[PDB]
């Protein structure tokens, strides 16, 4: 209970926490057995009379940066101020709260960019009250287009059921693009693993560490998802009908699969960390192999040439019959045989 | 009653009494002057700047009425913050942390607060204190403390302490920004030293701030009537502020643990480059000084005639070999 007192603010202040203030929109989809509408607008007061509608309603408010709209919707729909503070707190983990009239779910969607490997996270909130579902996002572009198309073109069961099936459809779409993201990260991790062994540079290290951190984020945001789907499936609060629980069970199994996949990826990147060091050691080995080969072949020749090239007053071997060619021949023989000796193994 | 604090030279007693309309300030060292302050129905605050002297703390404990064990906890300095409720008085344990920007170290000093009837005892360790704002607030009446009892005084003390926590967090935030900029721009072993010391400071801050949460929780959630219902909501605010501290602390650790990893992996990637340098130079100059020694053989058997610039021919062959080796290194991309 109570809205937490953040110091440095006026008491009871609702503040947006994220960073996206570019866009703001409201989109309404009122669908029934026979007829439907799509009332996309900006005047919040026009959306309100849908709270008491008989047919299921899907309200989608993008751009929660406008806290006045969120406060007005929460007040008219009878939503507790703590729920609103959770809505506007983007920095969070997926969670579920069951109330006497509405069910409040916090989920996360993710996007991945190529040529700029950033795992961008956008928090989306769902509030299922009566026969309506409120939806809160903070940027244009989501993964619920299949649901909109199914509703618009009357394909599937969604037009036949209540709003609980709508909430199930939304969560199913979220799990689907989770799978899509896992496939994209699979491709990226394969590319990075192949590259780290052939061109090991510091940018490979930076990319691998960024991938590892992204995977830690993914794990920390997927296990709460397992928890919330479990909470939706087992206890089945009164707002959710008893016939719609197998769907949530399927979504629960999907989340199990996603957790397994992210754990596998985490193990793979943990392996790539040691693989990089092994590869750089291999490169240093090649460089010093060249250095040690030239050293071994041409230092003994150098000191023997120095020894015969000395200023003793004696006359040991300075007038022998072509002694210089003999020295060069035997010396080249020893160099050739030691190069042959080094030709074993992978040194040469 | 053994004293373990590391501050011994400092000692002073100061009393601030106040009513709806009047206040009085008192400063002394002899405890005889602060004994008769029970009779003041209006709330009063007595501060013992130095607690090294066991005699004064023992006398004040036996005078106002203080359990032997909580008094021994007062004298003890290495103690986790705690709250104890007695019918006569309540006892609370707090910490103050000063952190110098230039001289990087996060120190501490222990405070004990005892609230019996209207007199609030504070047992400071040494000089250098934070609660100047509450002293100025009660000196110049621009608040609500005048209309409430010593309970609001305790609340004001704790609120000032959490404000000092916020200021320390701002300082640590500046240090973290500077450290991140240094790591991204230019690493160093002293940079690693800074990262490690900052990590340790964050760890100790988390360890010491977490008990304060349950301190405040005990102070409002199921509080006895000695802290008064009207005063209860105020403590709530303090609790909320505590949460922020904790939250901030954790995210700072989340940003300092991963700061150093790229440098940890990046070492031994200069090893290969220094091999590149040494190997190219050795490759150039091993055969070159080799043939230098070969031509310095002093054999004299093979004719060393002037020829067609024989010595320049030797130098030209040397330069050709050097150019060939440079081409080979370019091909190897070393």
């Amino acid at each position, epitope marked *: 209970k109570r809205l937490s007192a953040k110091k440095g*603010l006026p*008491p009871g*202040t609702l503040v947006y926490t994220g960073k996206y203030r*570019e866009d703001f929109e409201i989109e309404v989809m009122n669908y029934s057995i026979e007829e439907f509408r799509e009332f996309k607008t900006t005047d919040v007061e026009s959306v309100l009379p849908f709270r008491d509608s008989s047919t299921p309603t899907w309200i989608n408010i993008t751009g929660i940066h406008r*806290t006045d709209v969120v*406060q007005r919707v929460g007040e008219f729909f009878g939503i507790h101020p703590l729920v609103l503070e959770d809505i506007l707190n983007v920095h969070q983990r997926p969670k579920v709260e069951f109330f006497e009239n509405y069910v409040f779910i916090v989920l996360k969607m993710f996007t991945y960019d190529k040529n700029l490997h950033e795992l961008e996270s956008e928090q989306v909130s769902l509030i299922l009250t009566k026969n309506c579902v409120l939806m809160f996002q903070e940027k244009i572009g989501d993964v619920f287009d299949p649901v909109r198309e199914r509703i618009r073109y009357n394909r599937g069961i969604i037009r036949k059921k209540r709003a609980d099936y709508l909430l199930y459809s939304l969560i199913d779409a979220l799990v689907d693009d989770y799978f899509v993201l896992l496939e994209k990260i699979d491709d990226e991790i394969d590319v990075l693993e192949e590259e780290v062994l052939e061109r090991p540079e510091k940018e490979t290290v930076q990319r691998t560490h960024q991938l590892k951190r992204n995977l830690v984020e993914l794990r920390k945001t997927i296990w709460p998802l397992r928890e919330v789907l479990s909470s939706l499936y087992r206890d089945v609060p009164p707002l959710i009908e008893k016939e719609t629980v197998p769907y949530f069970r399927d979504v629960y199994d999907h989340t199990i699969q996603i957790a397994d996949t992210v754990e596998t990826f985490r193990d793979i990147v943990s392996g790539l960390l040691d693989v990089y060091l092994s590869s750089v050691s291999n490169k240093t080995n090649e460089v010093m192999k060249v250095l040690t080969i030239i050293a071994t072949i041409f230092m003994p020749l150098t000191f023997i040439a120095g020894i015969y090239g000395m200023n003793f007053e004696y006359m040991p071997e300075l007038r022998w019959k072509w002694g210089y060619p003999v020295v060069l021949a035997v010396m080249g023989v020893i160099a050739v045989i030691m190069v042959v000796y080094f030709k074993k193994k992978k040194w040469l | 009653l053994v004293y373990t604090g590391k501050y011994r030279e400092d000692f002073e007693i100061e009393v601030m009494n106040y009513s709806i309309e009047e206040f009085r300030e008192f400063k002394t060292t002899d405890v005889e002057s602060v004994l008769p302050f029970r009779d003041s129905s209006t709330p009063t605050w007595i501060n013992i700047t130095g607690i090294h002297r066991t005699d004064v703390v023992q006398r004040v404990g036996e005078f106002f009425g203080i359990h032997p064990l909580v008094l021994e906890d007062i004298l003890n300095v290495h103690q986790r913050p705690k709250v104890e409720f007695f019918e006569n008085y309540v006892f609370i344990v707090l910490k103050m942390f000063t952190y110098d920007k230039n001289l990087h170290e996060l120190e501490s000093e222990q405070v004990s607060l005892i609230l019996t009837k209207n007199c609030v005892l504070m047992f400071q360790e040494k000089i250098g204190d934070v609660f100047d704002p509450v002293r100025e607030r009660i000196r110049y009446n621009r608040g609500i403390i005048r209309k409430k009892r010593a309970d609001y005084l305790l609340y004001s003390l704790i609120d000032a302490l959490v404000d000092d926590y916020f200021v320390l*967090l701002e*300082k640590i935030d500046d240090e973290i920004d500077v450290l991140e900029e240094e790591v991204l721009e230019r690493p160093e072993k002293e940079t690693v030293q800074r990262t490690h010391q900052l990590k340790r400071n964050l760890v100790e801050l988390r360890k010491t701030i977490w008990p304060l949460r349950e301190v405040l929780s005990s102070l409002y959630r199921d509080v006895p009537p000695l802290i008064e219902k009207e005063t209860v909501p105020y403590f709530r605010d303090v609790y909320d502020h505590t949460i922020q501290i904790a939250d*901030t602390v954790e*995210t700072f650790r989340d940003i300092v643990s991963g700061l150093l990893d790229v440098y940890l992996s990046s070492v031994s990637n200069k090893t290969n480059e220094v091999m590149k340098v040494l190997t190219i130079i050795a490759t150039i100059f091993m055969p070159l000084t080799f043939i230098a020694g070969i031509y310095g053989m002093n054999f004299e058997y093979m004719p060393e005639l002037r020829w067609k610039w024989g010595y320049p021919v030797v130098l030209a062959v040397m330069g050709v070999i050097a150019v060939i080796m440079v081409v080979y290194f370019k091909k190897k991309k070393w």
Partner: antibody
Amino acid sequence: EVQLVESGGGLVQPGGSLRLSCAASGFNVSYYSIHWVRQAPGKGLEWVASISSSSGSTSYADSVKGRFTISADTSKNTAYLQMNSLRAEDTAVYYCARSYWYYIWSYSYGNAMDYWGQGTLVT
Amino acid sequence: DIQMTQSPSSLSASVGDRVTITCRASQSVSSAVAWYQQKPGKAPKLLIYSASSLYSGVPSRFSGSRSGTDFTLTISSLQPEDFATYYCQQSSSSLITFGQGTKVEI
């Protein structure tokens, strides 16, 4: 759409009393904090007052603390500033601005003024 | 008390060249600073908030940087419509303090 206007600037002898009214359109003054800022000719901007009409939160400038009085009435959806015992230096252009809070860290919040009123003149 | 000194007092530069205005705070401010543009006789406009975050609907030539307790407003490519006075801000405390005000001309 979201427009702030000011009224009440005029030729008033120093030491007098007057009232500046900031009328708001396109939004609700209840859900945002309204700031009053003063800029002198040849000088930079200088924040004066801040009101959070949702609560009693009221913060005046350091220089003129306790000499002004800011509030807001939601029936007209406007903010009010009461100026009493003016000085000679108070002659300047007054701007009324909305401001929203934003999040930096868990302990520290900031705020920014996104819409600025045209700003009356006081002498 | 807290104050924000903005340097330089004024700057003159051509069109299409980088312009940098630095700003220092008496007491450490976390990140709550802002940069504004004020045409003469007109209301100020909000350019940068959070010390690094570009406003919604404003050209990206303006950029913000933070180093320690110092903040820099930088311009990638100055324009003729960019000759005005730029200020700092503080939002750490309920007492908001503005910068000196640096005017950029041709």
